[PDB]
Amino acid sequence: MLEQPYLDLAKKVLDEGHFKPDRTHTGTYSIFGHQMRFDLSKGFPLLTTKKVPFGLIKSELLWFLHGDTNIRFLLQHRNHIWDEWAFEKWVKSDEYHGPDMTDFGHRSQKDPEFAAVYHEEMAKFDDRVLHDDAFAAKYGDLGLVYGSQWRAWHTSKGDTIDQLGDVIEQIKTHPYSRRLIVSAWNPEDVPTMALPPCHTLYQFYVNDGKLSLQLYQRSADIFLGVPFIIASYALLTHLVAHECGLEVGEFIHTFGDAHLYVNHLDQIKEQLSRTPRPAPTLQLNPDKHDIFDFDMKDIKLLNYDPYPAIKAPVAV
Amino acid sequence: MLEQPYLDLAKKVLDEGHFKPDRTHTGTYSIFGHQMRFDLSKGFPLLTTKKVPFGLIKSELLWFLHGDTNIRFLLQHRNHIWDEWAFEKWVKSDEYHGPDMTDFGHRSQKDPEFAAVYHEEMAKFDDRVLHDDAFAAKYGDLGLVYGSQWRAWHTSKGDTIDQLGDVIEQIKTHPYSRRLIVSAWNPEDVPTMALPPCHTLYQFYVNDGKLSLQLYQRSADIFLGVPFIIASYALLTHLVAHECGLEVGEFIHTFGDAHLYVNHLDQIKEQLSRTPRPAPTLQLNPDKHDIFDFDMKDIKLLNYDPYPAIKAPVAV
Numbered sequence: 001m002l003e004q005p006y007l008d009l010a011k012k013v014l015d016e017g018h019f020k021p022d023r024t025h026t027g028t029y030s031i032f033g034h035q036m037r038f039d040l041s042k043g044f045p046l047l048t049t050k051k052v053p054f055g056l057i058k059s060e061l062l063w064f065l066h067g068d069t070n071i072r073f074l075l076q077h078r079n080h081i082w083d084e085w086a087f088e089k090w091v092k093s094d095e096y097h098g099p100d101m102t103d104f105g106h107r108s109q110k111d112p113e114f115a116a117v118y119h120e121e122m123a124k125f126d127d128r129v130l131h132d133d134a135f136a137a138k139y140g141d142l143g144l145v146y147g148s149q150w151r152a153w154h155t156s157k158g159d160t161i162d163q164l165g166d167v168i169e170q171i172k173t174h175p176y177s178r179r180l181i182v183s184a185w186n187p188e189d190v191p192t193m194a195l196p197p198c199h200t201l202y203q204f205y206v207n208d209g210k211l212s213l214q215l216y217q218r219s220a221d222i223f224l225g226v227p228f229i230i231a232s233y234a235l236l237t238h239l240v241a242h243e244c245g246l247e248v249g250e251f252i253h254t255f256g257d258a259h260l261y262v263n264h265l266d267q268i269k270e271q272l273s274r275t276p277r278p279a280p281t282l283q284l285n286p287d288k289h290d291i292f293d294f295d296m297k298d299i300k301l302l303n304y305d306p307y308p309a310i311k312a313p314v315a316v
Numbered sequence: 317m318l319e320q321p322y323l324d325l326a327k328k329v330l331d332e333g334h335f336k337p338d339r340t341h342t343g344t345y346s347i348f349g350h351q352m353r354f355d356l357s358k359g360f361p362l363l364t365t366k367k368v369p370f371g372l373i374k375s376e377l378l379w380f381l382h383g384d385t386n387i388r389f390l391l392q393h394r395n396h397i398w399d400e401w402a403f404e405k406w407v408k409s410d411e412y413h414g415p416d417m418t419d420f421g422h423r424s425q426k427d428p429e430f431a432a433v434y435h436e437e438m439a440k441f442d443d444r445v446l447h448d449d450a451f452a453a454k455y456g457d458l459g460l461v462y463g464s465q466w467r468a469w470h471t472s473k474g475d476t477i478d479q480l481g482d483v484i485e486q487i488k489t490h491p492y493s494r495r496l497i498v499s500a501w502n503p504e505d506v507p508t509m510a511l512p513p514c515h516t517l518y519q520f521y522v523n524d525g526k527l528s529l530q531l532y533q534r535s536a537d538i539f540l541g542v543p544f545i546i547a548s549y550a551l552l553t554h555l556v557a558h559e560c561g562l563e564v565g566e567f568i569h570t571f572g573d574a575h576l577y578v579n580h581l582d583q584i585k586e587q588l589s590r591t592p593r594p595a596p597t598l599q600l601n602p603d604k605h606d607i608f609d610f611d612m613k614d615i616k617l618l619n620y621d622p623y624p625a626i627k628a629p630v631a632v
């Protein structure tokens with residue numbers, strides 16, 4: 001079926017992955033170098049073998065397109081995929097006055113009471129970011145995230161560059177260009193950042209009036225991460241095509257280090273027991289073509305009938 | 317044999333490559349997304365099916381390691397791989413006083429007399445760059461080439477960053493790092509440059525004490541370019557390992573747009589008639605480990621017995 005590459009990726013990592021000590025504490029079965037390609041004319045590569053919350057994919061991607069970098073948009077759409085990154089700044093704040101919260105996550109995955117204290121706290125933080133404008137502006141703004149990297153690369157002469165906005169024009173005027181690249185990797189930031197970009201760089205390609213996209217991902221979590229990345233980029237490939245009045249080609253997902261944390265082995269084996277079903281169908285608002293001004297309403301998924309969700313401990 | 321992936325790449329591009337109109341005039345058979353991997357413990361991937369001048373590979377790579385950007389080093393080693401890039405600046409110079417030389421290359425590949433005028437000129441230019449220090453400093457310095465991108469990325473606060481020098485340390489202190497990346501793609505330069513980097517970004521990877529490297533190449537000339545790129549990077553993989561006292565793993569060559577200009581079809585078909593031979597063996601100076609201070613003498617190739625060279629018109 002349409003999603004088999006993903007399953008083959010997991011199968012292969014189990015078979016010939018080497019035990020590599022991940023920086024955390026959790027070991028990993030990893031491989032270096034791998035490429036998968038999904039034909040977008042056959043179906044949206046949203047996995048049928050395990051329920052993946054498409055809402056979190058749309059909301060987050062749109063956030064990126066707007067060149068946004070403030071959690072607020074996310075919380076406004078019930079999206080917490082990025083909370084912890086902003087929250088950390090709060091607890092590290094010279095202004096923070098409350099419980100310990102140090103090395104949380106790690107200890108939040110152990111002490112049950114702490115987990116409750118930590119959750120009560122985070123809730124108050126999310127509330128603030130939603131109502132207090134000064135606060136949101138202060139801690140709710142991540143800064144160097146995908147949004148500004150794609151839409152506001154910072155120039156030497158204090159300028160800012162709209163990598164994407166420019167590439168899309170490039171596609172329209174030079175469809176056969178081999179320079180339709182967007183990088184999220186910047187040397188002067190890379191060392192100081194808490195988390196250098198995982199989706200490091202991508203390339204668009206046009207031919208026969210079909211649009212393909214290649215994503216070089218330096219590091220990946222085969223079980224908890226990849227299923228989401230496939231959708232974000234399959235969808236972005238759709239959005240750019242929609243605006244460019246072009247058809248969709250394929251999504252080529254190239255990997256650097258692909259890994260499967262040891263605490264997910266049982267879960268991935270179980271998923272493999274399952275048999276893929278026909279893929280869902282994406283549908284974008286025909287009356288709308290400016291993909292930046294897009295909103296949730298303008299992107300719909302049809303016939304997504306997955307197997308139940310598989311739960312697993314996030315390794316950290 | 318060791319080099320089969322390269323042949324399979326050419327075979328495949330011939331079979332299912334689409335006629336894509338290359339920006340030049342020469343058409344191309346291209347494909348998007350492709351990955352090849354060479355196991356470096358079996359042999360140096362220097363092609364046996366066609367004579368490839370290793371000298372031009374060594375000299376040029378070393379040039380890069382020194383963080384050099386001035387043609388002079390190259391001409392000093394009888395290397396002209398970069399002349400035209402510097403030469404163009406000469407003819408576009410407000411100081412240039414001599415023959416037309418406009419849209420050369422194109423017209424140098426047509427008019428035989430012009431080709432001779434053009435060659436006489438270039439010779440005088442190469443001579444100047446070798447003896448006139450002011451001149452060399454002025455036109456012999458390319459500026460934004462691989463050397464400075466790897467060794468002198470320009471920071472906002474006027475600084476410069478030694479991407480490579482840092483990554484190599486990173487390998488030594490954090491061998492299991494998934495952030496051993498070096499980018500040659502910079503957004504603020506990319507539009508103004510005459511030729512944005514083809515070898516866009518690479519990643520090192522260490523495991524079981526073996527060192528691998530992945531090269532994302534956005535655009536490639538299957539016939540005239542790829543055989544050289546395989547060597548440059550296979551060798552760099554060797555040099556870093558040598559300094560890091562690590563073994564060699566594999567070279568993974570990921571492609572964006574792989575193409576074969578139409579004026580090379582007959583030549584590639586001929587090469588395919590040939591049958592690969594045992595690969596040569598690289599050997600690096602054991603008494604020397606600082607790969608930046610390296611020189612020609614410290615890198616040797618053993619048993620390279622190729623088929624004769626295949627000549628073909630450079631498309632431009």
Ligand SMILES: O=c1ccn([C@H]2C[C@H](O)[C@@H](COP(=O)(O)O)O2)c(=O)[nH]1
Nearest residue numbers: 195198219220221224225226228494
């Ligand atoms: O959806 C996601 C979120 C995170 N990561 C993972 C990749 C690594 O497991 C970790 C980053 O580790 P470093 O590469 O920074 O060392 O985050 C994914 O692959 N997918």
Ligand SMILES: O=c1ccn([C@H]2C[C@H](O)[C@@H](COP(=O)(O)O)O2)c(=O)[nH]1
Nearest residue numbers: 178511514535536537540541542544
């Ligand atoms: O050794 C070399 C030298 C040059 N190129 C080619 C790639 C393209 O044919 C051309 C650059 O075209 P653009 O990508 O800039 O459009 O130079 C190679 O692949 N290998």
